Amino acid sequence: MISLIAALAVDRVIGMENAMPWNLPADLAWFKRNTLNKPVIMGRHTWESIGRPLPGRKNIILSSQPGTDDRVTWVKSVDEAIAACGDVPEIMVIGGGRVYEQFLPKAQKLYLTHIDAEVEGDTHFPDYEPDDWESVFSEFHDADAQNSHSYCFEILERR
Numbered sequence: 001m002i003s004l005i006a007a008l009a010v011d012r013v014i015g016m017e018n019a020m021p022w023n024l025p026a027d028l029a030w031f032k033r034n035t036l037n038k039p040v041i042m043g044r045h046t047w048e049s050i051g052r053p054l055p056g057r058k059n060i061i062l063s064s065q066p067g068t069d070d071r072v073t074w075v076k077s078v079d080e081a082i083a084a085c086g087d088v089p090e091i092m093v094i095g096g097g098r099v100y101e102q103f104l105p106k107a108q109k110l111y112l113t114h115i116d117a118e119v120e121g122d123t124h125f126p127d128y129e130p131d132d133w134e135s136v137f138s139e140f141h142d143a144d145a146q147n148s149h150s151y152c153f154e155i156l157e158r159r
């Protein structure tokens, strides 16, 4: 099974200038809990944005060019990325925009955080078709002293 995990600001913005400008510790904790002990697939730009391997996960990087770091696994196509995960119950696709586009048609589950924040961005999560997806979990949180925007965790499953 393939799942996508992402945090979206208003208008599906996910990034600006190869960064995420907000800081929501509760959402990073949600990301870690839902990805730990699973393989994670990311594109090269997202690898550079994170800047280090994510511990406790098999890190698989898509790039058309040879890898430059043997602490992670480098692959050259979507099918190779999936194969490199082996026989696991759930593969997590962690972006960015171009990678989400390619894996969305193959995904059974979306883990989305909706952040109540207006962000100028240059990268968006794909338009998906709402009729294709059932909401199976949602949890709203008001802003607090640690998290400066309200946010909603949602899990959707392909109908």
Ligand SMILES: NC(=O)c1ccc[n+]([C@@H]2O[C@H](COP(=O)([O-])OP(=O)(O)OC[C@H]3O[C@@H](n4cnc5c(N)ncnc54)[C@H](OP(=O)(O)O)[C@@H]3O)[C@@H](O)[C@H]2O)c1
Binding pocket: 005, 006, 007, 008, 013, 014, 015, 016, 017, 018, 019, 020, 042, 043, 044, 045, 046, 047, 049, 062, 063, 064, 065, 075, 076, 077, 078, 094, 095, 096, 097, 098, 099, 100, 102, 123
């Ligand atoms: N809010 C969130 O949840 C979230 C999550 C992830 C990322 N982001 C943000 O998203 C932005 C990065 O997204 P992006 O769309 O620019 O880039 P991306 O999807 O992270 O990376 C694209 C790169 O991945 C490689 N690639 C993708 N598909 C491939 C394929 N089928 N075969 C081979 N290589 C492939 C290519 O690398 P080469 O050029 O080396 O061939 C391509 O240039 C940043 O702003 C980041 O902060 C946000």
Ligand SMILES: Nc1nc(=O)c2nc(CNc3ccc(C(=O)N[C@@H](CCC(=O)O)C(=O)O)cc3)cnc2[nH]1
Binding pocket: 005, 006, 007, 020, 025, 027, 028, 029, 030, 031, 032, 046, 050, 054, 055, 094, 095, 112, 113
């Ligand atoms: N909901 C969500 N939020 C995100 O921030 C996110 N980020 C990415 C890609 N970028 C990043 C950037 C940093 C870290 C990171 O530092 N993660 C630590 C945090 C642990 C914690 O804060 O409790 C990790 O070990 O996962 C992960 C992904 C992909 N999907 C996402 N999905």
Ligand SMILES: [Mn+2]
Binding pocket: 077, 079
């Ligand atoms: Mn092929």
Ligand SMILES: [Mn+2]
Binding pocket: 086, 087
């Ligand atoms: Mn197999």
Ligand SMILES: [Mn+2]
Binding pocket: 116, 117, 118, 148, 149, 150
């Ligand atoms: Mn806000």
